[PDB]
Structure 1
Amino acid sequence: DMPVERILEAELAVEDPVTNICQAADKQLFTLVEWAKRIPHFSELPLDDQVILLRAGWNELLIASFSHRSIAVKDGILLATGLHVHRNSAHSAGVGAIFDRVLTELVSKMRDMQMDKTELGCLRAIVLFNPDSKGLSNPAEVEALREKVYASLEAYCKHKYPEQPGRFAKLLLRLPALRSIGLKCLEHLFFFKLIGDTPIDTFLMEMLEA
């Protein structure tokens, strides 16, 4: 009911540094909708609940994607726009603290365990199917979809990495760090909007709506 082959297919189907990062975020929000449509059973949920799940998880979903994309580089983040933000550039722009959190708690840990694209997609599908999201018409159905994702994820881990019995738990235990980092990035983005001297495009602005 939740095969990892379709979750990987969704990942492969979607392929001032503050300004560059905000422009990449808006670009990838469009791509995020196309990704979620390719996750099994997401498009079958009520349309209001599809909206709720994406508005609740977009920041974590985008952070996981560019963090995994950046395991190929050191002390840097690869943006979807083809630009690279070096650790030194982020520090010199005043956002070095949260940048270092992304490199240390996400990118380096992804690189250390060689997290593959199937595991990334499954973790993102778990984040997407967040049954704690407020306003869900049927939270039990979302919880059931989440359960099917991590059931398929564990089977994949035991089959492809039988020598790493703790790998399934290691993947899930990056989710608290992703949640904390996602919340801090939202905090920064609201401050940028309040000051008003950072260009924020329309889709990124819409995610900041009440």
Structure 2
Amino acid sequence: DLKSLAKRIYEAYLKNFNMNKVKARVILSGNNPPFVIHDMETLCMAEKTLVAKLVANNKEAEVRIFHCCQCTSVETVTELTEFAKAIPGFANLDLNDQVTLLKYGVYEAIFAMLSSVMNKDGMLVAYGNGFITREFLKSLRKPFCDIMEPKFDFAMKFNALELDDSDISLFVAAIICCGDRPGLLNVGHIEKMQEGIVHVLRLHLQSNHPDDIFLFPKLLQKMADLRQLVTEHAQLVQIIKKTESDAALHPLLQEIYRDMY
């Protein structure tokens, strides 16, 4: 039955995320090849082909890029909500606790999964059809050059763990089903659900990664690292909100960030 929980979570992940690690690696290995964005000329070219509606009329390049960042996050929140609804037991939680778990978990899950589309030189964007370089993102004017580099730093060490989609699906489920989120109504029930998922994760890692006896505590630490990564990201987004008047924040993301940390 524990194998069944792991399989059901893996299947829910493959169904609900447009990108998975196998799909990303096929693209990054070299139909629909990714357009490389490494400078302003190629950003503008990519925009006209991949987000044409955005530039059909323009705001600084950094602000257009941040808009695309937010649009990606909004889409991934939808994918995570559907994934969560398919996590065995999640739908038996109080509806308001479901909202709370998503509120506090989506950006931890976003940055964990972002690692799957990152390598040391850049990342896949726009449903796998663009590859934006890490150096180009670092080249943007402040504060926008500060968004992605900590996420690359997290991803390089996370990717060195050589997890596959069967591991990552359980890891993301564990992120979502966290009993210590603020404001939960049924802490005990969520703690027991989490314990079940974490139990399956521990056993799955033991079987799938027999070479690394520390892999489970490494991943527990990555969960903690992601919390700090999100707090820091929320702080930067707040700097953007107050100082970059042209950088409209999407209302769903505003709701997630509100009263968070």
TM-score, normalising length: structure 1: 0.89
Matched, 1:78 2:78: no
Superposition pairs for residues 120-135 of structure 1, below 5 Å? 120-135=168-183
Moved more, 17-26 or 79-88: 79-88
1:103 match: 152
Matched, 1:204 2:253: yes
Q: 1:145 aligns with which of 187, 193, 204?
A: 193
Q: 4+ residue stretches of structure 1 with deviation over 6 A?
A: none
Matched, 1:119 2:176: no
Q: 2:137 aligns with which of 84, 90, 95?
A: 90
Report the CA distance between 1:98 and its aligned residue.
4.7
The number of residues matched between the two structures is 207
1:8 match: 10
Alpha-carbon contact 2:147-2:236 (below 8 Å) kept: no
Q: Deviations over 1:97-150 (max 9, x none)?
A: 45232222x211232121111221222111111211122111011111111111
- Identity percentage over the alignment? 26
Unaligned runs of 5+ residues in structure 2 are 19-61
TM-score, normalising length: structure 2: 0.73
| Higher-Rg member (1/2) | 2
Unaligned runs of 5+ residues in structure 1 are none
Secondary structure, in 3 states, of the residue corresponding to 1:174?
Answer: helix
Matched, 1:33 2:35: no
Report the CA distance between 1:161 and its aligned residue.
2.0
Alpha-carbon contact 1:98-1:181 (below 8 Å) kept: no
Distance 1:34 1:63 in 2: 18
Report the CA distance between 1:10 and its aligned residue.
1.9
Distance 1:205 1:186 in 2: 10
Query: What is the aligned-residue RMSD (CA, Å)?
Result: 1.9
Distance 1:62 1:20 in 2: 15
Secondary structure, in 3 states, of the residue corresponding to 1:162?
Answer: coil
Distance 2:190 2:126 in 1: 29
